[PDB]
Design a protein around this ligand. Structure first.
Ligand code: HEC
Ligand code: HEC
Ligand SMILES: [Zn+2]
Ligand SMILES: [Zn+2]
Ligand SMILES: [Zn+2]
Ligand SMILES: [Zn+2]
Ligand SMILES: [Zn+2]
Lengths: 106, 106
């Protein structure tokens, strides 16, 4: 998928987790976010004029998705343990990772 | 100063900005945060076993303070224009930069 679709998948599923009632719903939404993050990691930020994969800022862009995936995996661990409220709180702590990349590259 | 003192300078002055009443108080607190950020940038995160300055994660650590300084400068621009509420809102958007580095390195 393109960057807009992957970002709206992250966006929508973050809200699904917030309103979820059980661990299966949380787990399903996190699993979809993980895939969207790894897909988005293959893209480049539009406003970044230098798109070189070896450039420090493209390293930083891809690295940000590795951090997000790691936090998604932390939340999935809690969901798989049945800890729904804890997993929802872990998903809330994703937001600063989203907002940080956005402020930096948009 | 050491890392703890610089971090508590960032912490305390973020609160000063929140409770400030005029542009001079906001400007003064942001100016002190800027200095603390550049000082902290010379340190290393304790839990990072590899302290090599050329290593990707030390590059990332120093880069995070460049981003924070840039956001501080954005807030200072607003404070210097007399835009107190706007500068306070810009300072609130620093928090995700703080929380992001913390989750990544602590
Ligand atoms: C964390 C869970 C999130 C969430 C919920 C979103 N993102 Fe991102 N994002 C990145 C870039 C470069 C853009 C700009 C895309 C463009 O200009 O075409 C975006 C954009 C968004 C949007 C806006 C979509 C729109 O309608 O314009 C939304 C809703 C969104 N994102 C959600 C880059 C990144 C990251 C790089 C490391 C990371 C991490 C995130 N975004 C994280 C998230
Ligand atoms: C943004 C404005 C902030 C604010 C308010 C704080 N930080 Fe940081 N911070 C970083 C590291 C590696 C540590 C660990 C230090 C250690 O283990 O000795 C910290 C710690 C803190 C604290 C806790 C102090 C304590 O009593 O233990 C506080 C209150 C704090 N910080 C405030 C690293 C970074 C960054 C690196 C790029 C950035 C940016 C920030 N911190 C940003 C902020
Ligand atoms: Zn959209
Ligand atoms: Zn960067
Ligand atoms: Zn980063
Ligand atoms: Zn302290
Ligand atoms: Zn890193």
């Amino acid at each position: 998928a393109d960057l807009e679709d992957n970002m709206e998948t992250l966006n929508d599923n973050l809200k699904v987790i917030e309103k979820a009632d059980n661990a299966a719903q949380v787990k399903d939404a996190l699993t979809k976010m993980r895939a969207a993050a790894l897909d988005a990691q293959k893209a480049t930020p539009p406003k970044l004029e230098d798109k070189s994969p070896d450039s420090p800022e493209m390293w930083h862009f891809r690295h940000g998705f590795d951090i997000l995936v790691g936090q998604i995996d932390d939340a999935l661990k809690l969901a798989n343990e049945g800890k729904v409220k804890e997993a929802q709180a872990a998903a809330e702590q994703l937001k600063c990772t989203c907002n940080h990349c956005h402020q930096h590259y948009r």
